[PDB]
Ligand binder design. Structure first.
Ligand code: ZN
Lengths: 121, 38, 134, 52, 123, 74, 52, 47
RNA sequence: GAGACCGAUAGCGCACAAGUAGAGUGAUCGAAAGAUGAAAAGCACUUUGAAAAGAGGGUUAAAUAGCACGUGAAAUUGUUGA
RNA sequence: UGAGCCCGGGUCGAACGGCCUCUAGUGCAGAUCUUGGUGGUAGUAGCAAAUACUUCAAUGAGAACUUGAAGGACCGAAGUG
RNA sequence: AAACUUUCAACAACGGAUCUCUUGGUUCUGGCAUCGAUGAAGAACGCAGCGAAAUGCGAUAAGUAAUGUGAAUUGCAGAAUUCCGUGAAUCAUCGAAUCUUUGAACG
């Protein structure tokens, strides 16, 4: 009654939707039958409920992986696929923008950098 | 009164659920100090 | 004494962590010594206890009772060993809880995962024995 | 009422001529589904619903 | 643990009751009227209190209590009829009589060697 | 009755004439609080509720707000 | 704690009532209501010369 | 003018208004008599 | 991570399903309440009683530890003895 | 001398004391003290108006105030509907 | 002589002091900087086989994926796990997700 996540990763979209349809159909017929003889059928309910959650989390994950490949070389990504971080860290200046310096500053560091030295005792 | 809303009806549904007493098997759990509903 | 600042010698913090431990930490706490024959075989002193292990009780009122472990009740920090039981009023046989520190393991339930546990402990004992020697 | 009618037809192959609904005081909905005269409630309940 | 520890339970019969919703003052005087009495005479007396034929003498808790001629047997004037206290003391006496029957003692020679009414926590 | 159920704080403190909540000030964007009552502040400060999101921030700080997936994961 | 014993709203009842002139907790639906506060002699009060 | 109410009987330990319906009331005690005598003596010995 | 701190009327109001129960129209006010035993082994069975419970018997090192549970003061009360 | 100290007997079950110094939230009969508990008063004051209840049978361990039937009263459509 | 009132003892009551304990508090010190329109803090309603509260979660609902450990959970019932395994767990870690109605709240 319990599906294995390792099996679900190998399968494709059409097989995953067929299995999801089978689990929903099996649960719906057995939900109308769970009204009497509540025994090991209740364990079948709990396994089917977790199995639907497993198929749903692998259908969604494969869709998000395909979208990230589609938006690999695109300037704008959907907000769900963007890194979350914090609100402050998303408005923080970029690493290239923070490290940018004036070219008068770059000339001074090119010709007079901080040297390595020692003083004898 | 006789005229209600469904949200008022659902709030009154929850109110009697808190008034329900505790089950007997909770009292038999190890490390339990609950005696009765309050 | 202690040296590292991350360690704590507080009594209440030690007691809070023991009685509020997760079941994964409770497995390491419920460890039992290996027998003398097993100690000279694997160079391993103690191991966390297991459902299939065979133990001998060396402390308590059920001393020298030998049997197979039947349950590792990590909630009350006790193990249940076969035939070491008491009777209720109703003539119903209920098992007595024994702490793993009061038993000695005389046979192991061996799988691939245990064999890595004996190997990893054995590797460090001869590492320092060679370090102390040469 | 339209969603209950479609769900009974699509899943359990049950035709209904009228559906009545109330919300129970617990906050859950109760649906009365009257069938077509051709089918029998006792035959359907014994077969699919598993009810004597 | 009973109050009278000098009496061994093997040759005796005992019965107790706790948190009994009867008046403590009426039950104290009823237990004092039957103290040291025979078992069959005490059971007959308590039923007469129910039927208002004999009266229980009130000695300590008898403030502004009426007078009756049935107290002349006890040498007092203030005597009452605690029916509720008589009902509870009958059931405890029948319980101890059953305890003697189970143990094998003779019910014809049983006396009330010890009887005590203590105060319960107040409602 | 002079007060009804507020929709922001859940207390029966919404005036039926002024239409302003006496506990939080619902039509105002800011939640009402004053410094002459430390008791009222601790009754509605962070930690009095469920903390859906603020309880998950400290774990993500510890690992550096990292993205991606561990190598070799199925 | 500098606020220990001072986190309460209490006032004296008066000088004509046959009770001690000690500040008492206002209210009326609690055990705490009408009980003395703000004193070294009082339960859940403020001890004499708080340690600094 | 004012009504003097004793702190005796049904009036012991009343936080507010007693059952005497009057515009102004004053509640008195035994312990006031010690204080009023002291205040009268201090006035008599300083006037 | 610590203390020449406090140890359930103390220490934060809160060692407990505490800003809870409860009070007020409302702003707000705001408690009380820790401890069986190493292990529930938390009285099988019999007997009396409508029942609650009681007495035998049993568990335990301890029922002088009966979930009105460690130790169990005083005020106050009962019985017995003088 | 005294504040107190020490021992015997019973209960109980896990930590405690002498000596020299150090330290303090350190010694109570009162504060109409605070909190909690407990008395006498006291089996006392008292348990109203709305006129009114009665007989047999059933149920039940137990029936004035639970039911059925039968008598006696009442609201009187501006009702006790 | 009894009763009654008072004194002392014994045992039993009432009550919760003392003693011992403490996953709590109080104060000091040290390392670091991290809420929200990508929808915060707070409010509500639901979700467990048998749950009222506290807790966790959100119709994938006392939870899913992934990683690590390596055989449990436990008050009861039922499956499990073939145990030489993609692998138990009210386990831990945590980089992927799901995320009802409101609330700055935005047809
Ligand atoms: Zn509001």
């Amino acid at each position: 009654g319990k599906v294995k996540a390792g099996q679900l990763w190998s399968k494709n979209k059409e097989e995953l939707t067929k299995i999801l349809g089978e689990l929903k159909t099996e649960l719906s017929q057995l939900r109308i039958q769970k009204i009497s003889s509540s025994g090991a059928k209740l364990n079948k309910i709990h396994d089917l409920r977790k199995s639907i959650a497993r198929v749903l989390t692998v259908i969604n994950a494969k869709q998000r992986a395909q979208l990230r490949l589609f938006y690999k070389n695109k300037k704008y990504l959907p907000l769900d696929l963007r890194p979350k971080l914090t609100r402050a860290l998303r408005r923080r200046l970029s690493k290239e923008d923070a490290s940018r310096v004036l070219e008068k500053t770059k000339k001074r560091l090119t010709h007079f950098p901080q040297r390595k030295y020692a003083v004898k005792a | 009164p006789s005229h209600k809303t469904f949200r008022i009806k659902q709030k009154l549904a929850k109110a009697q659920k808190q008034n329900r007493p505790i089950p007997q098997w909770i009292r038999l759990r190890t490390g339990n100090t609950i005696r009765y509903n309050a | 004494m202690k040296v590292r600042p991350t360690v704590s010698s507080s009594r209440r913090k030690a007691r809070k962590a023991h009685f509020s431990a997760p079941s994964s930490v409770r497995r390491v706490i419920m460890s039992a010594p290996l027998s003398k024959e097993l100690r000279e075989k694997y160079n391993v002193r103690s191991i966390p206890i297991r459902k299939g292990d065979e133990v001998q009780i060396v402390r308590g009122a059920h001393k020298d009772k030998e049997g197979k472990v039947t349950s590792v009740y990590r909630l009350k920090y006790v193990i249940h060993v076969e035939r070491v039981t008491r009777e209720k009023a109703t003539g119903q046989t209920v098992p007595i809880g024994i702490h793993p520190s009061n038993v000695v393991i005389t046979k192991l339930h061996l799988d691939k995962d245990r064999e890595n546990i004996l190997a990893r402990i054995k590797a460090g004992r001869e590492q320092v024995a060679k370090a102390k020697g040469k | 009422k339209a969603q209950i009618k479609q769900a009974l037809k699509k899943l359990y192959d049950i035709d209904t001529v009228k559906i009545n609904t109330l919300i129970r005081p617990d906050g859950t909905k109760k649906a009365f589904a009257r069938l077509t005269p051709d089918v029998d409630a006792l035959d359907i309940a014994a077969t699919k619903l598993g009810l004597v | 643990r009973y109050a009278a520890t000098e009496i061994a339970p093997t040759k005796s019969a005992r019965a107790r009751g706790s948190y009994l919703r009867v008046s403590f003052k009426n039950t104290r005087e009823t237990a004092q009227a039957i103290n040291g009495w025979k078992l069959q005479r005490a059971l007959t007396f308590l039923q007469n209190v129910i039927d208002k034929k004999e009266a229980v003498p009130m000695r300590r808790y008898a403030g502004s209590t009426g007078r009756t001629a049935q107290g002349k047997q006890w040498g007092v004037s203030r005597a009452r009829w605690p029916v509720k206290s008589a009902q509870f003391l009958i059931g405890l006496l029948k319980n101890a009589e059953a305890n003697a029957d189970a143990k094998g003692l003779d019910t014809g020679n049983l006396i009330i060697k010890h009887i005590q009414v203590n105060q319960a926590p107040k409602q | 009755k002079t007060h009804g159920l507020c929709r922001r704080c859940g207390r029966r403190s919404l005036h039926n004439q002024k239409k302003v909540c006496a506990s939080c000030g619902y039509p105002a964007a800011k939640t009402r609080k004053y410094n002459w009552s430390e008791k009222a502040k601790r009754r509605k400060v962070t930690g009095t509720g469920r903390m859906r999101y603020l309880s998950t921030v400290p774990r993500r700080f510890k690992n550096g707000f990292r993205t991606g997936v561990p190598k070799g994961a199925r | 704690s500098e606020k220990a014993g001072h986190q309460t709203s209490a006032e004296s009842w008066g000088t004509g009532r046959a009770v001690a002139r000690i500040p008492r907790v206002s209210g009326g639906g609690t055990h705490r209501a009408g009980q003395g506060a703000f004193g070294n002699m009082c339960r859940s009060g403020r001890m004499f010369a708080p340690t600094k | 003018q004012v009504k003097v109410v004793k702190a005796t009987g049904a009036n012991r330990g009343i936080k507010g208004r007693p059952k005497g319906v009057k515009g102004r009331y004053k509640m008195v005690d035994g312990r006031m008599k010690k204080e009023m005598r002291a205040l009268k003596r201090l006035a008599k010995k300083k006037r």
